Amino acid sequence: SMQDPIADMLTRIRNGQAANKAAVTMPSSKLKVAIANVLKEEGFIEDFKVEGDTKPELELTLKYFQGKAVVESIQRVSRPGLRIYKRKDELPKVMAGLGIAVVSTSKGVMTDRAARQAGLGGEIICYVA
Amino acid sequence: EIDYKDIATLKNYITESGKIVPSRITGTRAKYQRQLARAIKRARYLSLLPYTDRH
Amino acid sequence: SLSTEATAKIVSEFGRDANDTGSTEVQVALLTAQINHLQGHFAEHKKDHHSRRGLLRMVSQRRKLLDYLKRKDVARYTQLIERLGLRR
Amino acid sequence: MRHYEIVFMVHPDQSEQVPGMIERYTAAITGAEGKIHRLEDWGRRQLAYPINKLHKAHYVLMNVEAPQEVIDELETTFRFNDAVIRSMVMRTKHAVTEAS
Amino acid sequence: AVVKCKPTSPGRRHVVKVVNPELHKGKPFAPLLEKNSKSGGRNNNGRITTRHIGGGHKQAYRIVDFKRNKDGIPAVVERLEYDPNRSANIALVLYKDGERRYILAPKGLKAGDQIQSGVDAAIKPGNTLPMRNIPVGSTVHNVEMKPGKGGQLARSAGTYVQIVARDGAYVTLRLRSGEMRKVEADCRATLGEVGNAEHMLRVLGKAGAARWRGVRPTVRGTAMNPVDHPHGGGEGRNFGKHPVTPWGVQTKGKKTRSNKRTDKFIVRRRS
RNA sequence: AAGCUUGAGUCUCGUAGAGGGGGGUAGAAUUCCAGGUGUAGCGGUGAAAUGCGUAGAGAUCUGGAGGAAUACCGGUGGCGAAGGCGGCCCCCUGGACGAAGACUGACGCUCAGGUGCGAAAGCGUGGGGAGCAAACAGGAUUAGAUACCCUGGUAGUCCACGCCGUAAACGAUGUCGACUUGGAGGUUGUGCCCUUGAGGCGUGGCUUCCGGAGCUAACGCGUUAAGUCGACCGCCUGGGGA
RNA sequence: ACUAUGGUUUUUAUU
RNA sequence: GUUUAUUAAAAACACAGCACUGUGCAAACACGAAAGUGGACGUAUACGGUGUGACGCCUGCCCGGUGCCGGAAGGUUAAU
């Protein structure tokens, strides 16, 4: 049956940027707007904006580079059948610094770069390059 | 749509041999054809329309 | 297939709002009446294995609703089998 | 309500025996305290193909407006009858006056 | 039913018994019972005249109305019960003014059913009428071969007869044995099938259980000497001759009908 | 610990079908029994013979029956999960589909073992048994012919009930569910258009053919994906021996 | 277009 | 379970069952030429004759002989 709210968001991004879509939309949540604010300033999306307040929605403007998507791989890894936790140096190196790992933390959603700079760790959300 | 008490309306959807004419010919389409087939098959068993043909 | 007035007989007893069936107690009472109406075709011999698959599906639906109800509230379970012939 | 047309075909020379059965073909419904909508003839007709070596027969219909728990008695009603050659039931269809 | 047995001595576990819980287990209607003393297969002055019949248990005979005396009288089926003189079970019929008779049973097991003879009588099976008033293909139950003579043929458990033609004054029967013959349309038919129908599913169990069913042994003719039974031959286990009756006549395939009275009414016969 | 609902479902009013089961009974054609008319052939084939033929066949006309199987309609037309379902009738009954309104609220998915489900053949057991025919005989073919060919013919094929779970199981591809560019056709609901048009414009379910992105030795899949993701469970590990 | 039909041809040398 | 009572108690005999077959009821058939009676006052799921002998798994060849059933034309052939 319907199993995961984040696969329903990542498929719209991944398949929408493969199908040259301008901006893609899904149901909102606290987590979904937290990762949008990372993916924005790390340059993986061109804009994010919410719509509504009762049954709320989120719209992401996709970002392109040289006639393809700005993203080369966005991978889950941390999934309902296997969650991944990473400590302050135990954090992996995504594509030798050409990509990021996204961490939830007790202190705010951030990159593994910002987590190393804070001596911090937590649960993984995704790996992006 | 179902009754045997008029054959003058049913004659249009049959042959001289009493065979049922396919819906692609008569503009009936499959749904109404399957109704006319019931009126005809009832009128057949009441001996109001020919069933079998040999000559 | 169920008798045309028999769905409203569940609303007239296990229901608490007009024409409403959202209650799991109405669903289990309706499924129990539907199982009883389908036992009219059985209660003799095993020949119709196809219509028996739909019987097992509604018997499983009643079991799956009762598992959810036992996980919800034990009194709402116990008071349902007090108005229906379960655990006889 | 449950409906059945109950149409039957009789041997032409036994058409004189049918008025002696005008309460017998309905005996399944009279035994249920009911009354049929029609019980009327549809005239004498020639057959499109011969049945039990007859070529012309007499037609009658009842329109019983009666329940499905006496439809088995309406089967026995013709099972041991010598005057018929065929009967047919035609379930539902409703029942109306005039035009047979 | 029918149902399996259970072993009390080796062996019975696979034996089957009929069992009919819809029949009344009570007492037969006494004004219809006769002593009917056994004769041991021996006639008035004999000596044996039918072999293997011998022994009891003691049994009274129940008088059945196969002749169906009086006509058109309303009745009801008051009891259905078993009868050991026969195999199709019996019906106890009660006429409207208190007259009780034993009559040959229907296929039905529901009691209180109201039954009468006639042609303006309800068309149902069990209401007896003359074969001049019925259509072809009908199953007739037990019938009379001459008007008013009474019921013969198809009296055994679940047996019946079918009428397969009619013309003028006469009707043609098809028999389940492979026979086809005419009778007069003034003869009475009760319609449908006779009671029990399960008797052929039974398998008795143990040799002794026949000894109270009117059975005694008799030694194989092939196992004794030719002074005694003509099938006997010196040293045995290799006869060199055809098998025979106790009178030295053929016992496989030889036809024996010689009636010459009833045969001109017959169309087809048993193989 | 407590709210919320989008997930899933039902209800009001409606939509469609060879889905299954119980009980009836009807439209013809093999074939055989019986009579009229009638005469020496019929059947097979590269040829034939066994076989049927004056014991009057075949052909024709007619009277009649058991039992198996059900033309047309019938289709890019449907149902079932799969085996499977297309004489017709009467009774009974499974699952699926839509609009809008509403209620309940995670009630949803999957699953070693286990359970239910079996085309045909075979088997338990009785009944049936026209026809088709594994065994096989007789004939013929041939090097041979225990096979292919011709004439028969037992089991079996039909029914009730019980066993046996098998497959080039086929839409070959586990079950459930998300996601993605475009076109045209078929079917059928619903809402709308005097429908005053089997037709349109929205919009669902089913279905059919390209095809964008992706995948694949290669064919091919492509919104009913073999693509990209979320949950669960089986099966595999060079040929032969096996 | 389709006769009515037939089974079987020792092994080995371009490095 | 039965048996040569008094030299044989058995592997023979008997049996649910299994098979082959007769029989349409004034049944087949018995004893009697018949008179009757039994079968049976039962009725093809009933009765008669015979063989075979739990069950399981299976079960090739033969119509020259001997008896039966059907086919019915013709032949040998009686009284007449």
PDB file of C-alpha atoms in Angstrom, chain E residues 29 31-32 63 65 76 78-79 91-103:
ATOM      1  CA  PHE E  29     -50.471 -50.289  12.950  1.00  0.00           C
ATOM      2  CA  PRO E  31     -55.062 -54.243  12.404  1.00  0.00           C
ATOM      3  CA  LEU E  32     -52.898 -54.883   9.319  1.00  0.00           C
ATOM      4  CA  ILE E  63     -50.909 -55.783   4.724  1.00  0.00           C
ATOM      5  CA  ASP E  65     -53.121 -51.568  -0.133  1.00  0.00           C
ATOM      6  CA  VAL E  76     -53.288 -37.508   4.699  1.00  0.00           C
ATOM      7  CA  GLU E  78     -49.842 -39.676   9.003  1.00  0.00           C
ATOM      8  CA  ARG E  79     -46.563 -41.711   9.387  1.00  0.00           C
ATOM      9  CA  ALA E  91     -46.460 -44.857   4.384  1.00  0.00           C
ATOM     10  CA  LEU E  92     -49.446 -44.948   6.763  1.00  0.00           C
ATOM     11  CA  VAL E  93     -52.373 -43.173   5.021  1.00  0.00           C
ATOM     12  CA  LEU E  94     -55.385 -41.786   6.899  1.00  0.00           C
ATOM     13  CA  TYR E  95     -58.611 -41.075   4.958  1.00  0.00           C
ATOM     14  CA  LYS E  96     -60.773 -38.055   5.999  1.00  0.00           C
ATOM     15  CA  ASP E  97     -63.342 -40.271   7.877  1.00  0.00           C
ATOM     16  CA  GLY E  98     -60.786 -42.190  10.013  1.00  0.00           C
ATOM     17  CA  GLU E  99     -59.889 -45.179   7.752  1.00  0.00           C
ATOM     18  CA  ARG E 100     -56.136 -46.202   8.041  1.00  0.00           C
ATOM     19  CA  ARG E 101     -54.175 -48.223   5.454  1.00  0.00           C
ATOM     20  CA  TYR E 102     -50.529 -49.021   4.598  1.00  0.00           C
ATOM     21  CA  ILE E 103     -49.520 -47.696   1.177  1.00  0.00           C
TER      22      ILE E 103
END
